[PDB]
Amino acid sequence: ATPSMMPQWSYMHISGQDASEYLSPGLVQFARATETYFSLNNKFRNPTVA
Amino acid sequence: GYNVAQCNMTKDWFLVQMLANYNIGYQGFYIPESYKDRMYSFFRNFQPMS
Known about the structure:
This is part of a larger assembly, with two copies of chain A (50 residues).
Chain A: H1 7-11, H2 19-22, H3 25-33
Site (Involved in interaction with pre-protein VI) (chain B): 25
Subcellular location (chain B): Virion; Host nucleus
Protein name (chain B): Hexon protein
């Protein structure tokens, strides 16, 4: 079935939106502002579906 | 016990060199990528002996 049928898989980031979506946009801009000298590009996993 | 890497070097100097040549160290340590580590770099020419 479509994954959004069950909410848990959406809650644990198993299926649903990506990294850039659920975050409050201020923090996304913050991360994109300091990619070099203080990373944050691995603190959240964004799923994929076939 | 300020020695590290099983050599006679204090931690602080190791951290300073790693930062100044790779911006690496505030988030652990690992092996920097090849193209960012040329011949005259720090890491390629560091040998501890005992």
